[PDB]
Write an enzyme that holds these catalytic residues in place. Structure first.
Site, PDB file in Angstrom:
ATOM      1  N   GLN A  11       0.823  -1.204   0.000  1.00 55.71           N
ATOM      2  CA  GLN A  11       0.000   0.000   0.000  1.00 55.71           C
ATOM      3  C   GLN A  11       0.858   1.255   0.000  1.00 55.71           C
ATOM      4  O   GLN A  11       0.605   2.190  -0.767  1.00 55.71           O
ATOM      5  CB  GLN A  11      -0.936   0.004   1.205  1.00 55.71           C
ATOM      6  CG  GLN A  11      -1.686   1.306   1.375  1.00 55.71           C
ATOM      7  CD  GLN A  11      -2.971   1.141   2.146  1.00 55.71           C
ATOM      8  OE1 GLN A  11      -3.027   0.402   3.127  1.00 55.71           O
ATOM      9  NE2 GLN A  11      -4.017   1.828   1.706  1.00 55.71           N
ATOM     10  N   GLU A  63      -3.287  -7.163  -2.125  1.00 61.44           N
ATOM     11  CA  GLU A  63      -4.607  -6.615  -1.859  1.00 61.44           C
ATOM     12  C   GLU A  63      -5.142  -5.910  -3.098  1.00 61.44           C
ATOM     13  O   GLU A  63      -4.400  -5.191  -3.772  1.00 61.44           O
ATOM     14  CB  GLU A  63      -4.553  -5.624  -0.697  1.00 61.44           C
ATOM     15  CG  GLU A  63      -5.821  -5.556   0.129  1.00 61.44           C
ATOM     16  CD  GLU A  63      -5.669  -4.671   1.347  1.00 61.44           C
ATOM     17  OE1 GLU A  63      -4.519  -4.329   1.696  1.00 61.44           O
ATOM     18  OE2 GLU A  63      -6.698  -4.320   1.961  1.00 61.44           O
ATOM     19  N   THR A 171       1.428   2.315  13.431  1.00 66.42           N
ATOM     20  CA  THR A 171       0.072   1.888  13.126  1.00 66.42           C
ATOM     21  C   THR A 171      -0.152   0.393  13.284  1.00 66.42           C
ATOM     22  O   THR A 171      -1.308  -0.038  13.309  1.00 66.42           O
ATOM     23  CB  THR A 171      -0.306   2.291  11.695  1.00 66.42           C
ATOM     24  OG1 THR A 171      -1.693   2.014  11.473  1.00 66.42           O
ATOM     25  CG2 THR A 171       0.528   1.518  10.692  1.00 66.42           C
ATOM     26  N   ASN A 220       3.721  11.325   0.758  1.00 67.36           N
ATOM     27  CA  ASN A 220       4.063  10.780  -0.549  1.00 67.36           C
ATOM     28  C   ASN A 220       4.518  11.870  -1.503  1.00 67.36           C
ATOM     29  O   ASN A 220       5.402  11.639  -2.330  1.00 67.36           O
ATOM     30  CB  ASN A 220       2.874  10.026  -1.136  1.00 67.36           C
ATOM     31  CG  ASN A 220       2.360   8.948  -0.216  1.00 67.36           C
ATOM     32  OD1 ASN A 220       3.001   8.606   0.777  1.00 67.36           O
ATOM     33  ND2 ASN A 220       1.189   8.413  -0.530  1.00 67.36           N
ATOM     34  N   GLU A 246      26.981   6.138  -9.958  1.00 71.19           N
ATOM     35  CA  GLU A 246      27.852   6.999  -9.169  1.00 71.19           C
ATOM     36  C   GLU A 246      27.369   7.171  -7.737  1.00 71.19           C
ATOM     37  O   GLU A 246      28.187   7.467  -6.857  1.00 71.19           O
ATOM     38  CB  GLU A 246      27.987   8.369  -9.831  1.00 71.19           C
ATOM     39  CG  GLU A 246      28.462   8.306 -11.264  1.00 71.19           C
ATOM     40  CD  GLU A 246      29.006   9.626 -11.761  1.00 71.19           C
ATOM     41  OE1 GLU A 246      28.259  10.626 -11.740  1.00 71.19           O
ATOM     42  OE2 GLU A 246      30.182   9.665 -12.181  1.00 71.19           O
TER      43      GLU A 246
END
Ligand SMILES: Nc1nc2c(ncn2[C@@H]2O[C@H](COP(=O)(O)OP(=O)(O)OP(=O)(O)O)[C@@H](O)[C@H]2O)c(=O)[nH]1
Ligand SMILES: Nc1nc2c(ncn2[C@@H]2O[C@H](COP(=O)(O)OP(=O)(O)OP(=O)(O)O)[C@@H](O)[C@H]2O)c(=O)[nH]1
Ligand SMILES: Nc1nc2c(ncn2[C@@H]2O[C@H](COP(=O)(O)OP(=O)(O)O)[C@@H](O)[C@H]2O)c(=O)[nH]1
Ligand SMILES: Nc1nc2c(ncn2[C@@H]2O[C@H](COP(=O)(O)OP(=O)(O)O)[C@@H](O)[C@H]2O)c(=O)[nH]1
EC number: 3.6.5.-
Lengths: 430, 51, 431, 51, 40, 430, 431
Positions: A11, A63, A171, A220, A246
């Site tokens: 997820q 999922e 969580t 995100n 590199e």
């Protein structure tokens, strides 16, 4: 010619991939339909005869919900439907479920699609594996996939942008368990692993963006900006180009030591933007600030071994040189005695594109600092007691045993994490 | 016409080179503007006028 | 009729070479399309030193670009003078060296090296007479340093008698770009000492200092530094390409500059470098040129000549000038600064004069100083190499390319012996 | 942000001011969307809806 | 509306007929110092 | 006046003949209809009272498709309809099929038309046989036709521009079988056989013309240019004329040794043209470069026995003398001890004409280097183990036996190729 | 002008033949009424391979339809292209075979076989030149398998030299349709080994797997499977019908494929098969088509090539393509998967190129692989046949037709010998 294959497992992997691919589409002008109104996109997109561009990405999850969200959202005409791979049963936060029983057929199909993708790439800079250490899908299936990739592809550089559990906030409950298992797995397969912590990115959003309710979309978006800055030198020309190959040469002193703290700068909302000068020296200082680290790991505890700086936008080598000289003269920033230079500066002429709908401001300059430092052992130290505290009672261990694991696997993972702690102590010591 | 693929490769190479040429010309103009700044440019002319 | 084969290596070397070829074509009146537009006979008189006449009026540089990644060459081809180069002289790989001298010298440089030597031999045999090869590249980078040293070794093997000139951009003292610069420089200097007949050391930080203090520019990009390097690269060979009152070729410079075969590293500088503000304030005279020439700030090397002793120094002047003026100036410089000049050499100056100054300048002068000051630069590079090698940091990346650990220590030993020779002739006493 | 852009402390801002605020929050917002939200917040007003 | 094509000279036909003259002309066209085999 | 009869056998023969006759029509100004708007065409075309010119060629094949393509294409009014000979059943990569059962009536008709063609020629320099070593049609029927020509015509020089299988890349499976059989056949009949390899010409196209996707049309264009350069001395005047009889007498040290490597120079596209001097010395060096050889056979392995150079365009004997002297002084090029001269230079004043739509550029100078060297034994060595590896298991042997072959034929062919290897070793050795 | 006689046998064979003729007419631009409506010269250039000209512009397929029950050919006639076939080529009995190979080969097949051979001879004598016969039918069915094997034997007797190509639908591994499939398959394979020059094996479950995984269809009826099969049947012979850069007839394919006469069983596949969603997403390159070709999931036979070793493999490409590109792709495939390729054959690939791709597709490619993987298919059929034959289940139905029990043993022995040959050449070592 500079193709990079993106893998998003679990997820968290898929949700950071959404931000990453939205950012890439915005940066390269590719509309969500798939085509844009040269060849700078080839790193992330492969163009067809019709002119429509498909990303070289693979969304892997056991999922169906997360992948179906992508299949239903705006980016449904962009991605490859078969590249979106969906499982039937979730791993249920079980590393054994994601690594031994459910993950087998899924990883076989994943390797099939990965072969098909790599066959379309003339060159191949490497793999960008975005997963979530702390979940059965991300940890177990991701570990299996990394092992298979190491076995078959071989020396291709795999950069793992992993998200470990935060020190205090979390969580899940079996998160120490599957995190220890996956860390055992990925110590020996990934080439450069980038640590990310939800608590640290939450703190960054709260303090710098003034977001009192940071969320996964904001996290995100920050991660996507960081990866875009990391890959900017592959797609856009600029002075002091830096490569995927590199990274390893200028950042990995020894094969076991390849875990990296990542810090982006500046992180400012538009209301606070154009209210400070945002010079190169100031953005370098902000990037080296401990609060700007995306891992709850104070660098003051350890010592820096290497620091790769990726500058984006209107940045001049004189300014990067002056800023790095000030950093070297700075006392709180401490380097290991055996690395006198310890710096890999690389500039790019493409400023960071701003995502509409995001909180980041349109800034003409940016720095992405990815550092190898011995302080990172502290997070492993936290998980090493969070693990053994539950392991003493063998709590939740029956869950992992039921899908074909053994107490020996837990013992080996704990011992290897202890060995990694010892290695970090040894590299830190003179 | 029978050799479309060879012509397609030629066109791809030409387009890539033209695009890189456009980028280099733009960067050369920007660098000329940046390097034009020197002592002769009136960076402190306002300060001299005020004094 | 004395030809020079130019080679560019790596990103820095390719940028420097592109700037240099732009400057040389400007000097000879050649437009980016290759046609001559100079309206001066002396420009076409000795054009064959650097260029070859194509079927038409086009003149193509005798330049060979080598690289492991195609991006730098794409930029060079798309630059303003990118079309003069023959397309076949762009020899590029597909996977670049990750700042790895081992990758650029053994693993990936080996396959491309035969193509490079094929191009080099094809260009060399076309030459009626060959003065030699000049290779411009940067120490402290993978493809540049590695493949440059490999190619220099191969060309030395094939043409031992022909001149070899190198323009090496040594990694900067204070601000280093990449981590592995000491490793790459250590492995490259060992090759240059054995192979290169003549070596010119450049430092980006010395270039920044000179462009900040003399030129007083505010935003010096890499283009300005490459411009200064190109000015020196042209001025060293302008005595070949133009008539001179007292002309002197590359071999003459090497003979008069190199006392002993291993002591062939030189710091260079160009005059007159004047800020746009002070251009009208400065007066163009031979004494002014010499004054800026012998200023340590003018040296494009990080090491300053004050710390060491000048073994030798060549001064190639350009412009309609008095030989009495030039000779007297160099004599007064030697007499005033006899403490900085080696005692056991009666005259430490090779003075050369060319009648054609560079465009825009009434007068110019390039300085090539062989002094024991370069000792401190090599010493600093070794101070970094030893610190890294004691704990063997990043050594696995070179080891995985299949080069012995003993090779690192051999290169370090060669550097230390070279430093010892420079110190020996710094503190050598006559009789 | 709306308070900072409201000089009079009147609690009300014009269309230009609230579009500036909404752009400072999210750059991608256009003025038409902000005006539409203004209208749906206060139907009958001569601008200056309470932020 | 009459179609036309350029008439060639007698000198060109003579040069094509003669091996020596053609080769000397080609040598003169070869390059710019002293022309290679300039003197016909 | 100096006619040469062209024979094109098999698909490769007809496909290279298409390019060859396009090149000849362009070079002589002959329009595809048949007529053109002195007597330089007599080598390749015979003019009729109507003014229309017909080529002295014969297109032989057992398959109707390739011949009917020419019958339908632009050159339908050029060639003689009966000269285009079509079979009914293809030879199916079977040397026995093309040499014993199907080929009989076809070769009878071929001799009939060849006799008709030769009766129309005052002189006859010889035959130019273009076939495909490695297929039933080219190998079998070509061998049968060559044998019949040797029987009846006798001493006429047959120059066979044969296409041999490439070392690693190939398109057929029984290609070693029919290649060995055809080599047995043509060792004793053809006067000068030139080897050509698809792999070598593909490498030439990729490296020199920068065609990343070379095809048979490009290969045939290069071959046609080589043949036109070879025949230029028959049609156009120049200093140091070379004749078909002279190639042999200057190139074939012994009757058994008459196989030749071929190289063309320069091979440059229009974009790459007019960027290099293209002097005589440079193009001669290019012709002597091993990469420019049209056979995957490095000439360094052996020693040159003879080298015939065919120059086209602005080339002077002083320049050719200087270039060849530099070639002799070159250390890499090595000649046999018993041939001090080993060079046959011949110049022609006609520059090579450029085919519109092709990739070759308009160059004022050209060199065709045809070399007899002992290095050519390497390709026979490769085919000799490729043959016996299949022959140990008698794979595909029943196919050849079915059309009137015997195991003795395979044994004899293998032994003769071994003897040819031995002869090459003997002549190479002092 | 090299004609092919098509024969359809049984229900499955007749359906496949009808779909194949529909596909061929679509490619040649032939409407169901027989008139040419293609507006392309090349379509009519070689229309004689499959069709003959009628009184007007109508073109009649050279197909011969066989059955013991009239229902299947009633369906064929009622189909969209049911009126192209000549009514005289429909040969039917009145009582269909109840999945009885003995009934279709000895009792009921004997009477109709005279008419079948009469029609075959009539169609063949009209042909100028005859490449051979192609017979489409299903193993594991009474009328299909029995009548097909009997007709193949008769045609082999009549025309020994002419090619025999067979498309046999071998009974599926996992889910079987009828019980006596192992008997019918065992009896038919023994005949095909002796008579059929060249045979392709198709499995309904393999077709289902490919249409579920590649095409991603939801409700694939038998029509879709027949259309895939028809694509293969067309693509194997498109080189006869269209000009090709490197053409290859059926005899050339057989020569390059069959090392030893008994090993003439092949697995085939068609590219590019793309699902609707991924059609814009897939980019058509020769490497892409080869990658889809050499995948095991693309094979239309149940046996996966990974278990076995590729003795030979022909690939017929169609479209505007580079022969260099195709040959390089096949050489790369062989080098990469040398473990799956037989050592004692240096080149295991027969590449053919045709210049005319199928309608709508830019380019396509059909594959024909002779590999020892088919050994496991025959082994599974043996494992079923022996299991039923030990207890002689359903053997009385075959016995009551005048069939000896010894014939079953002979067929099993022959099929086991074929399996043994495949294993021998799988594990054969060079030298
Ligand atoms: N930074 C960041 N972390 C996330 C995000 N979404 C989920 N995570 C982390 O990912 C972890 C679990 O991810 P997954 O394993 O993929 O969850 P899943 O898809 O249901 O798979 P399982 O939980 O293993 O069954 C959680 O502990 C979160 O901390 C996100 O959007 N951003
Ligand atoms: N160089 C080159 N070779 C070709 C060309 N066309 C075909 N070939 C070669 O010719 C060989 C086969 O030629 P043929 O024997 O005449 O093929 P065919 O016309 O079908 O006749 P058979 O194969 O005998 O049945 C192949 O192996 C190719 O390598 C071409 O255009 N150029
Ligand atoms: N003067 C100058 N120096 C450069 C330029 N580009 C890079 N450099 C310097 O050269 C050093 C070596 O880089 P380089 O050899 O080009 O990298 P490589 O091509 O991968 O080997 C770097 O540390 C840069 O600081 C340029 O354009 N001009
Ligand atoms: N692919 C395909 N297979 C079929 C079709 N019809 C029947 N089959 C299969 O063919 C096998 C044999 O049936 P078949 O021989 O046609 O029965 P028969 O005509 O009475 O001999 C059965 O197991 C079916 O699954 C069809 O239209 N397409």
């Amino acid at each position: 010619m500079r193709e990079v294959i993106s893998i998003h497992i679990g997820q968290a992997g898929i949700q950071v991939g959404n931000a990453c691919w939205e950012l890439y589409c915005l940066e390269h002008g590719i509309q969500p339909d798939g085509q844009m109104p040269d060849d700078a996109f080839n790193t992330f997109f492969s163009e067809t005869g019709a002119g429509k561009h498909v990303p070289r990405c693979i969304f892997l999850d056991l999922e169906p919900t997360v992948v179906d969200e992508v299949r239903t959202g705006t980016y449904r005409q962009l991605f490859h439907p078969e590249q979106l791979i969906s499982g039937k049963e979730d791993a249920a936060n079980n590393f054994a479920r994601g690594h031994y029983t459910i993950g087998k057929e899924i990883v076989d199909l994943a390797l099939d699609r990965i072969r098909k993708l790599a066959d379309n790439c003339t060159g191949l800079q490497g793999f960008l594996v975005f997963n979530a250490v702390g979940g059965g899908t991300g940890s177990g299936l991701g570990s299996l996939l990394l092992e298979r990739l190491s076995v078959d592809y071989g020396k291709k550089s795999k950069l793992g942008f992993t998200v470990y559990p935060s020190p205090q906030v979390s969580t899940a409950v079996v998160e120490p368990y599957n995190s220890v298992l996956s860390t055992h797995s990925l110590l020996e397969h990934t080439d450069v692993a980038v640590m990310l912590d939800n608590e640290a990115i939450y703190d960054i959003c709260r303090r710098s963006l003034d977001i009192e309710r940071p969320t996964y979309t904001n996290l995100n978006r920050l991660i996507a900006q960081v990866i875009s800055s990391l890959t900017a030198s592959l797609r856009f020309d600029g002075a002091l180009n830096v490569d995927i190959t590199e990274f390893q040469t200028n950042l990995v002193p020894y094969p076991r030591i390849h875990f990296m703290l990542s810090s982006y700068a500046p992180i400012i909302s538009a209301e606070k933007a154009y209210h400070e000068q945002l010079s190169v020296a100031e953005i370098t200082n902000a990037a080296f600030e401990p609060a700007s680290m995306m891992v709850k790991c104070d660098p003051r505890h350890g010592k820096y071994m290497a620091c790769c700086l990726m500058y984006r936008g209107d940045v001049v080598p004189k300014d990067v040189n002056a800023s790095v000289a000030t950093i070297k003269t700075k006392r709180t920033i401490q380097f290991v005695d055996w690395c006198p230079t310890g710096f890999k500066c690389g500039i790019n002429y493409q400023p960071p594109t701003v995502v509409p709908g995001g909180d980041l401001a349109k800034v003409q300059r940016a720095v992405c600092m990815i550092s190898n430092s011995t302080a990172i052992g502290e997070i492993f130290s936290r998980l090493d007691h969070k693990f053994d505290l539950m392991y003493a009672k063998r709590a939740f261990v029956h869950w992992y045993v039921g899908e074909g694991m053994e107490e020996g696997e837990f013992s080996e993972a704990r011992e290897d994490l202890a060995a990694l702690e010892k290695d970090f102590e040894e590299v830190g010591a003179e | 016409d029978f050799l479309t693929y060879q012509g397609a490769d030629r066109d791809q190479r030409a387009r890539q080179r033209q695009a890189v040429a456009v980028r280099t010309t733009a960067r050369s103009e920007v660098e000329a503007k940046l390097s034009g700044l020197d002592d002769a440019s009136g960076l402190d002319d306002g300060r001299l006028q005020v004094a | 009729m004395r030809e020079i084969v130019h080679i560019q290596g790596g990103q820095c070397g390719n940028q420097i070479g592109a700037k240099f070829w732009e400057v040389v074509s400007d000097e000879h009146g050649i437009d980016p399309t290759g046609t001559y537009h100079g309206d001066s006979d002396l420009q076409l008189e000795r054009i064959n030193v650097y260029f070859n006449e194509a079927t038409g009026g086009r003149y193509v540089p005798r330049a060979i670009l080598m690289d492991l990644e195609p991006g730098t060459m794409d930029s060079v081809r798309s630059g303003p003078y990118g079309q003069i180069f023959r397309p076949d002289n762009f020899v590029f790989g597909q996977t670049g060296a990750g700042n790895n001298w081992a990758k650029g010298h053994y693993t990936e440089g080996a396959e491309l090296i035969d193509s490079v030597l094929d191009v080099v031999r094809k260009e060399a045999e076309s030459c009626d007479c060959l003065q030699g090869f000049q290779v411009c590249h940067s120490l402290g980078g993978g493809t540049g340093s590695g493949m440059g040293t490999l190619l220099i070794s191969k060309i030395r093997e094939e043409y031992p008698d022909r001149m070899m000139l190198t323009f090496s951009v040594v990694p900067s003292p204070k601000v280093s770009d990449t981590v592995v610069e000491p490793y790459n420089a250590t492995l490259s200097v060992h090759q240059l000492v054995e192979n290169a007949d003549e070596c010119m050391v450049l430092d980006n930080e010395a270039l920044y200092d000179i462009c900040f203090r003399t030129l007083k520019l505010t935003t010096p990009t890499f283009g300005d530094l490459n411009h200064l390097i190109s000015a020196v690269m042209s001025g060293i060979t302008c005595c070949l390409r133009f008539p001179g009152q007292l002309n002197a070729d590359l071999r003459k410079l090497a003979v008069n500059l190199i006392p002993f075969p291993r002591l062939h590293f030189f710091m260079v500088g160009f005059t007159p470098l004047t800020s746009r503000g002070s251009q009208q304030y400065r007066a163009l005279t031979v004494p002014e040129l010499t004054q800026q020439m012998w200023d340590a700030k003018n040296m494009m090397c990080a090491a300053d000549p004050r710390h060491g002793r000048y073994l030798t120094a060549s001064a190639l002047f350009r412009g309609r000038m008095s030989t009495k003026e030039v000779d007297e100036q160099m004599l007064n410089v030697q007499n005033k600064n006899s403490s900085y000049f080696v005692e056991w050499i009666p005259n430490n100056v090779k003075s050369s004069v060319c009648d054609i100054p560079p465009k825009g300048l009434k007068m110019s002068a390039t300085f090539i100083g062989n002094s024991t000051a370069i000792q401190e630069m090599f010493k600093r590079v070794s101070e970094q190499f030893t610190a890294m090698f004691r704990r063997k940091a990043f050594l696995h990346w070179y080891t995985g390319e299949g080069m012995d650990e003993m090779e690192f220590t051999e290169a370090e030993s060669n550097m230390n012996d070279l430093v010892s020779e420079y110190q020996q002739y710094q503190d050598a006493s006559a009789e | 942000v709306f308070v900072r852009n409201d000089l009079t402390r009147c609690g009300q801002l014009p269309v230009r001011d609230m579009t500036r605020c909404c752009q400072a929050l999210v750059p991608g917002i256009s003025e038409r969307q902000v005006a539409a939200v203004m209208a749906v917040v206060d139907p009958n007003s001569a601008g200056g809806v309470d932020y | 509306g009459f179609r036309n094509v350029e008439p060639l000279s007698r000198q060109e036909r003579a040069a094509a007929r003669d091996k020596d003259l053609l080769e000397k002309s080609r040598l003169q066209a070869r390059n710019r110092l002293k022309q290679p085999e300039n003197v016909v």
